[PDB]
Amino acid sequence: NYHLENEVARLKKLVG
């Protein structure tokens, strides 16, 4: 939306 998108694109970028 919101969240969701700038939340995977958080997350997975920092982890893997």
mmCIF file of all heavy atoms in Angstrom:
data_model
loop_
_atom_site.group_PDB
_atom_site.id
_atom_site.type_symbol
_atom_site.label_atom_id
_atom_site.label_comp_id
_atom_site.label_asym_id
_atom_site.label_seq_id
_atom_site.Cartn_x
_atom_site.Cartn_y
_atom_site.Cartn_z
ATOM 1 N N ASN A 1 0.791 -1.240 0.000
ATOM 2 C CA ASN A 1 0.000 0.000 0.000
ATOM 3 C C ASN A 1 0.823 1.289 0.000
ATOM 4 O O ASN A 1 1.106 1.816 -1.074
ATOM 5 C CB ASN A 1 -1.191 -0.081 0.958
ATOM 6 C CG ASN A 1 -2.219 1.048 0.865
ATOM 7 O OD1 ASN A 1 -2.385 1.716 -0.154
ATOM 8 N ND2 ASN A 1 -3.055 1.033 1.900
ATOM 9 N N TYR A 2 1.502 1.748 1.047
ATOM 10 C CA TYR A 2 1.687 1.567 2.494
ATOM 11 C C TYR A 2 2.208 0.226 3.011
ATOM 12 O O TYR A 2 1.879 -0.836 2.486
ATOM 13 C CB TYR A 2 0.401 1.900 3.253
ATOM 14 C CG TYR A 2 0.602 2.231 4.733
ATOM 15 C CD1 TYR A 2 1.599 3.085 5.189
ATOM 16 C CD2 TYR A 2 0.057 1.330 5.641
ATOM 17 C CE1 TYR A 2 2.151 2.966 6.459
ATOM 18 C CE2 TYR A 2 0.623 1.209 6.905
ATOM 19 C CZ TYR A 2 1.652 2.027 7.355
ATOM 20 O OH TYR A 2 2.141 1.947 8.621
ATOM 21 N N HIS A 3 2.853 0.300 4.172
ATOM 22 C CA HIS A 3 3.485 -0.833 4.861
ATOM 23 C C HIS A 3 4.063 -1.809 3.836
ATOM 24 O O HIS A 3 4.987 -1.386 3.141
ATOM 25 C CB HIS A 3 3.021 -1.477 6.170
ATOM 26 C CG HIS A 3 1.613 -2.074 6.223
ATOM 27 N ND1 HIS A 3 1.107 -2.338 7.425
ATOM 28 C CD2 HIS A 3 0.622 -1.989 5.340
ATOM 29 C CE1 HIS A 3 -0.191 -2.559 7.237
ATOM 30 N NE2 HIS A 3 -0.504 -2.320 5.967
ATOM 31 N N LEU A 4 3.739 -3.097 3.908
ATOM 32 C CA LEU A 4 3.568 -4.032 2.786
ATOM 33 C C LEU A 4 4.734 -4.072 1.796
ATOM 34 O O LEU A 4 5.586 -4.956 1.852
ATOM 35 C CB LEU A 4 2.195 -3.767 2.167
ATOM 36 C CG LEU A 4 0.988 -4.632 2.538
ATOM 37 C CD1 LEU A 4 1.138 -5.266 3.923
ATOM 38 C CD2 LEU A 4 -0.228 -3.709 2.444
ATOM 39 N N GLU A 5 4.778 -2.958 1.071
ATOM 40 C CA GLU A 5 5.825 -2.612 0.100
ATOM 41 C C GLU A 5 7.111 -2.018 0.678
ATOM 42 O O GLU A 5 8.111 -2.728 0.772
ATOM 43 C CB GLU A 5 5.123 -1.732 -0.936
ATOM 44 C CG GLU A 5 4.378 -0.480 -0.471
ATOM 45 C CD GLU A 5 5.271 0.757 -0.350
ATOM 46 O OE1 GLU A 5 6.187 1.083 -1.135
ATOM 47 O OE2 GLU A 5 5.092 1.477 0.655
ATOM 48 N N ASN A 6 7.002 -0.863 1.330
ATOM 49 C CA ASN A 6 8.067 -0.378 2.218
ATOM 50 C C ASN A 6 7.915 -1.018 3.601
ATOM 51 O O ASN A 6 7.723 -0.341 4.609
ATOM 52 C CB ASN A 6 8.209 1.140 2.090
ATOM 53 C CG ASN A 6 9.153 1.528 0.951
ATOM 54 O OD1 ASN A 6 10.307 1.897 1.167
ATOM 55 N ND2 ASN A 6 8.681 1.728 -0.275
ATOM 56 N N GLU A 7 8.180 -2.318 3.521
ATOM 57 C CA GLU A 7 8.241 -3.254 4.653
ATOM 58 C C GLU A 7 8.890 -4.570 4.220
ATOM 59 O O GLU A 7 9.781 -5.022 4.938
ATOM 60 C CB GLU A 7 6.857 -3.672 5.151
ATOM 61 C CG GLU A 7 6.628 -3.411 6.642
ATOM 62 C CD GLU A 7 7.360 -4.310 7.640
ATOM 63 O OE1 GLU A 7 7.683 -5.485 7.360
ATOM 64 O OE2 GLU A 7 7.680 -3.722 8.695
ATOM 65 N N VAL A 8 8.642 -5.045 3.002
ATOM 66 C CA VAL A 8 9.514 -6.083 2.433
ATOM 67 C C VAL A 8 10.863 -5.511 1.991
ATOM 68 O O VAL A 8 11.902 -5.969 2.465
ATOM 69 C CB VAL A 8 8.788 -6.855 1.331
ATOM 70 C CG1 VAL A 8 9.707 -7.951 0.789
ATOM 71 C CG2 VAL A 8 7.574 -7.428 2.065
ATOM 72 N N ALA A 9 10.745 -4.361 1.334
ATOM 73 C CA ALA A 9 11.844 -3.516 0.845
ATOM 74 C C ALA A 9 12.642 -2.847 1.967
ATOM 75 O O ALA A 9 13.624 -2.151 1.714
ATOM 76 C CB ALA A 9 11.135 -2.435 0.025
ATOM 77 N N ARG A 10 12.084 -2.907 3.172
ATOM 78 C CA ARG A 10 12.864 -2.920 4.418
ATOM 79 C C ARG A 10 13.440 -4.333 4.542
ATOM 80 O O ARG A 10 14.386 -4.644 3.821
ATOM 81 C CB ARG A 10 11.898 -2.276 5.415
ATOM 82 C CG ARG A 10 11.329 -0.868 5.231
ATOM 83 C CD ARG A 10 10.518 -0.496 6.473
ATOM 84 N NE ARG A 10 11.368 0.154 7.482
ATOM 85 C CZ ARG A 10 10.888 1.076 8.328
ATOM 86 N NH1 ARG A 10 9.571 1.228 8.523
ATOM 87 N NH2 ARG A 10 11.804 1.801 8.984
ATOM 88 N N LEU A 11 13.323 -4.990 5.693
ATOM 89 C CA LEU A 11 13.382 -6.453 5.831
ATOM 90 C C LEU A 11 14.402 -7.307 5.076
ATOM 91 O O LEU A 11 15.515 -7.575 5.525
ATOM 92 C CB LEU A 11 12.021 -7.144 5.931
ATOM 93 C CG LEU A 11 11.906 -8.333 6.888
ATOM 94 C CD1 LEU A 11 12.701 -9.574 6.477
ATOM 95 C CD2 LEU A 11 12.348 -7.855 8.272
ATOM 96 N N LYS A 12 14.082 -7.493 3.799
ATOM 97 C CA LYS A 12 14.768 -8.467 2.939
ATOM 98 C C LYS A 12 16.095 -7.868 2.470
ATOM 99 O O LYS A 12 17.067 -8.578 2.217
ATOM 100 C CB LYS A 12 13.854 -8.661 1.726
ATOM 101 C CG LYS A 12 14.576 -9.256 0.516
ATOM 102 C CD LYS A 12 13.688 -10.250 -0.235
ATOM 103 C CE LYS A 12 13.320 -11.407 0.697
ATOM 104 N NZ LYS A 12 12.575 -12.470 0.007
ATOM 105 N N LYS A 13 16.184 -6.541 2.449
ATOM 106 C CA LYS A 13 17.347 -5.751 2.020
ATOM 107 C C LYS A 13 18.499 -5.668 3.023
ATOM 108 O O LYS A 13 19.662 -5.418 2.710
ATOM 109 C CB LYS A 13 16.934 -4.323 1.657
ATOM 110 C CG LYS A 13 16.193 -4.329 0.319
ATOM 111 C CD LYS A 13 16.218 -2.900 -0.231
ATOM 112 C CE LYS A 13 16.115 -2.848 -1.757
ATOM 113 N NZ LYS A 13 16.528 -1.506 -2.188
ATOM 114 N N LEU A 14 18.026 -5.603 4.265
ATOM 115 C CA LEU A 14 18.772 -5.677 5.529
ATOM 116 C C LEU A 14 19.104 -7.121 5.911
ATOM 117 O O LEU A 14 19.938 -7.267 6.804
ATOM 118 C CB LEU A 14 17.892 -5.156 6.666
ATOM 119 C CG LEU A 14 17.347 -3.768 6.324
ATOM 120 C CD1 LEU A 14 16.197 -3.316 7.225
ATOM 121 C CD2 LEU A 14 18.423 -2.681 6.328
ATOM 122 N N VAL A 15 18.230 -8.092 5.662
ATOM 123 C CA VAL A 15 18.548 -9.489 5.990
ATOM 124 C C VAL A 15 19.079 -10.265 4.782
ATOM 125 O O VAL A 15 20.301 -10.293 4.658
ATOM 126 C CB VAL A 15 17.424 -10.177 6.767
ATOM 127 C CG1 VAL A 15 17.888 -11.557 7.238
ATOM 128 C CG2 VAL A 15 16.761 -9.335 7.857
ATOM 129 N N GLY A 16 18.099 -10.846 4.094
ATOM 130 C CA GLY A 16 18.304 -11.559 2.825
ATOM 131 C C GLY A 16 17.031 -12.131 2.198
ATOM 132 O O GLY A 16 15.921 -11.691 2.492
#
